[PDB]
TrEMBL record:
<feature type="domain" description="NADH:flavin oxidoreductase/NADH oxidase N-terminal">
    <location>
        <begin position="3"/>
        <end position="342"/>
    </location>
</feature>
<dbReference type="InterPro" id="IPR001155">
    <property type="entry name" value="OxRdtase_FMN_N"/>
</dbReference>
<feature type="binding site">
    <location>
        <position position="301"/>
    </location>
    <ligand>
        <name>FMN</name>
    </ligand>
</feature>
<feature type="binding site">
    <location>
        <position position="322"/>
    </location>
    <ligand>
        <name>FMN</name>
    </ligand>
</feature>
<dbReference type="GO" id="GO:0005829">
    <property type="term" value="C:cytosol"/>
</dbReference>
<keyword id="KW-0560">Oxidoreductase</keyword>
<dbReference type="GO" id="GO:0010181">
    <property type="term" value="F:FMN binding"/>
</dbReference>
<feature type="binding site">
    <location>
        <position position="23"/>
    </location>
    <ligand>
        <name>FMNH2</name>
    </ligand>
</feature>
<feature type="binding site">
    <location>
        <position position="25"/>
    </location>
    <ligand>
        <name>FMNH2</name>
    </ligand>
</feature>
<comment type="similarity">
    <text>Belongs to the NADH:flavin oxidoreductase/NADH oxidase family.</text>
</comment>
<dbReference type="Pfam" id="PF00724">
    <property type="entry name" value="Oxidored_FMN"/>
</dbReference>
<feature type="binding site">
    <location>
        <position position="99"/>
    </location>
    <ligand>
        <name>FMNH2</name>
    </ligand>
</feature>
<feature type="binding site">
    <location>
        <position position="141"/>
    </location>
    <ligand>
        <name>progesterone</name>
    </ligand>
</feature>
<feature type="binding site">
    <location>
        <position position="301"/>
    </location>
    <ligand>
        <name>FMNH2</name>
    </ligand>
</feature>
<protein>
    <submittedName>
        <fullName>Pentaerythritol tetranitrate reductase</fullName>
    </submittedName>
</protein>
<dbReference type="GO" id="GO:0016628">
    <property type="term" value="F:oxidoreductase activity, acting on the CH-CH group of donors, NAD or NADP as acceptor"/>
</dbReference>
<feature type="binding site">
    <location>
        <position position="180"/>
    </location>
    <ligand>
        <name>progesterone</name>
    </ligand>
</feature>
Length: 363
């Protein structure tokens, strides 16, 4: 039998189905101020039939910014704009989580406070690109700036920034928060030995590498409730030039066992980037499942059939779709009815306006 269209308790909220909208950066916010817009509100409202919407990555602070057009959740104006957006999703009987990030070294000095180098675990360039805007407001890809290593005494401020952003998210009407601990952003920069060469209590051993993310988890659980907190990890493979080191499986299971102790709402595993790669072994999925007692969300080039298979095997609880959610506001109905999926238009994934954003039709 099909399980994708059955309900699921996700911490404090109940999803009516297991077809989730993955977090999707679309870079359409207002500058100055990194402000969400009514257009963004319309886009999310169109997708409110999702079992859970997980928002685009959203800054915890101005320092957190790495992309021109990505929204924040640190200023009064951002809070006010997000309130309207969550109200719109709720008017359509949806549920929405905010994905909260600090981009760390995947950033550029031109968009940092004071024009300064972005921060990271260590002073190592990401060796990739980020997205800025040109003089006409269009998205452009630009090489990342070499970061400054955070001083030990700056770490509590980073934890506080996540805490504060969660207070703001609760006020803004989000149902859950998802900590962005994946894809080579700040939390992952600390987790990975490839990006973390620190020799203090925040580098070296896996305990030390996971210290920041677990301090963040504890701070946000205390601010709100554990049943309001999710986390996204990409702990197996390489993402955006950040690998997971020479003991990736053991290190992942350590982190997951620690997360389980906090009783958080969910663990969201980004299994691959768009270029693909090694599938998770069944054995690894089993080791994760026996250690974590919240919801597990699988993501990365899934099909409905793969989701059904893994849900049926008792290994995951839900699936997050990314690109299919860009193109199909009613993806739930389409998967339920076995309807075709709208053609994707990748040229309009990042930046611009309504075209390629709010103009994909329902059935
Ligand atoms: C345009 C675009 C933006 C994305 N933005 C985010 C993001 O903000 N946060 C995140 O964790 N992953 C982000 N991702 C990754 C997706 O959540 C997802 O893992 C990826 O698209 C693979 O899943 P899919 O095959 O269902 O599209 C993004 C992907 C795309 C294509
Ligand atoms: O084209 N992409 O696959 C983008 C992925 C992405 C883009 C922004 C943030 C993040 O965590 C992942
Ligand atoms: O995790 N990622 O590899 C993200 C990549 C990305 C993120 C934002 C814009 C873009 O063109 C690519």
């Amino acid at each position: 039998a099909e399980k994708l269209f059955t309900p699921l308790k996700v911490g404090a909220v109940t999803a009516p189905n297991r077809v989730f909208m993955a977090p999707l950066t679309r870079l359409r916010s207002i500058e100055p101020g990194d402000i969400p817009t009514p257009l963004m509100g319309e886009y999310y409202r169109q997708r409110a039939s999702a079992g859970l919407i997980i928002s685009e990555a959203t800054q915890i602070s101005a320092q957190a910014k790495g992309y021109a057009g990505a929204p924040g959740l640190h200023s009064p104006e951002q809070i006010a704009a997000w309130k309207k957006i969550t109200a719109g999703v709720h008017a359509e009987d949806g549920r929405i989580a905010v994905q909260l990030w600090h981009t760390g070294r995947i950033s550029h000095s031109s968009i940092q406070p004071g024009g300064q180098a972005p921060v990271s675990a260590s002073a190592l360039n990401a060796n990739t690109r980020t997205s800025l805007r040109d003089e006409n407001g269009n998205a452009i890809r630009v090489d990342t700036t070499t970061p400054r290593a955070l001083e030990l005494d700056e770490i509590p401020g980073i934890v506080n920034d996540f805490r504060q952003a969660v207070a703001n998210a609760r006020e803004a009407g989000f149902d859950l928060v998802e900590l962005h601990s994946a894809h080579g952003y700040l939390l992952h920069q600390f987790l990975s030995p490839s990006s973390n060469q620190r020799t203090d209590q925040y580098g070296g051993s896996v305990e030390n590498r996971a210290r920041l993310v677990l301090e963040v988890v504890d701070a946000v659980c205390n601010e709100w409730s554990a049943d309001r907190i999710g986390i996204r990890v990409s702990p197996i493979g390489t993402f955006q030039n950040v690998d997971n080191g020479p003991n990736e499986e053991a290190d992942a299971l350590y982190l997951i066992e620690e997360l389980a102790k906090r009783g958080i709402a969910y663990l969201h595993m980004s299994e691959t980037d768009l270029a693909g790669g090694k599938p998770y072994s069944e054995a690894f999925r089993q080791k994760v499942r026996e250690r974590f007692h919240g919801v597990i969300i699988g993501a990365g080039a899934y099909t409905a059939e793969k989701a059904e298979d893994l849900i049926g095997k008792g290994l995951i609880d839900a699936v997050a779709f990314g690109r299919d959610y860009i193109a199909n506001p009613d993806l739930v109905a389409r998967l339920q009815k076995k309807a075709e999926l709208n053609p994707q238009r990748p040229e309009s994934f990042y930046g611009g306006g309504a075209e390629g954003y709010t103009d994909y039709p329902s059935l």
